[PDB]
């Protein structure tokens, strides 16, 4: 399978399946014209998804509640397992998939000064310089990939066609 997701600031599209609510940037930075500010909407371009499932995310510094980087699909320590880091790691969610710039224009965006991008399934209505997606995305990802046998290639193209706020309504409702 080869899947080129698209993200327009409010919706993550899986062609042939459907649409997922999605959000990028901290509360005041959810704007295409702020995409080179740290923790703002992710820069436009092409990114590879690392969907290999690798279990729990590494913990770079538990004392500082600092998760390490990892190039795959990993889970977030939460609840009692996270201890006092729960409040911080709720901003990750329960799942994260690493992204990496995949071509020249994307690697050179913003002078190359931004990075550490992921798709993750927190329900905050914001993201610390990443893409927060409706949690069902990860259930569909698991179900679709576990019924295929060969190589599985996932990318996402980020393209803002509107100046509207890059918030897809992912904050937990009612």
């Amino acid at each position: 399978m080869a899947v080129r997701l698209t993200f327009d600031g409010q919706k993550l599209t899986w062609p042939g399946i459907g649409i997922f609510k999605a959000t990028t940037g901290l509360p005041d930075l959810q704007w295409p014209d702020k995409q080179c500010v740290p923790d703002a909407a992710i820069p436009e371009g092409n990114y590879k998804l690392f969907i290999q499932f690798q279990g729990e995310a590494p913990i770079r510094n538990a004392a500082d509640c600092d998760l390490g980087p990892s190039w795959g699909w990993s889970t977030i320590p939460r609840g009692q397992a996270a201890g006092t880091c729960e409040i911080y790691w709720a901003n990750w969610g329960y799942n994260r998939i690493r992204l990496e710039s995949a071509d020249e224009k994307t690697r050179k965006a913003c002078g190359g000064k931004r990075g550490g991008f992921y798709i993750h399934d927190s329900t905050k209505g914001y993201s610390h310089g990443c893409i927060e997606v409706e949690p069902v995305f990860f259930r569909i990802l698991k179900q679709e990939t576990e019924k295929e046998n060969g190589e599985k290639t996932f990318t996402v193209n980020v393209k803002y066609v509107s100046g509207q706020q890059t918030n897809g309504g992912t904050k937990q409702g009612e």
Binding site: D64, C65, D66, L67, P69, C85, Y88, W89, N91, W92, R114, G115, G116, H128, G129
Partner: peptide, 5 residues
């Protein structure tokens, strides 16, 4: 680091 948490 790109992130502190």
């Amino acid at each position: 680091h790109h992130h502190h948490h």
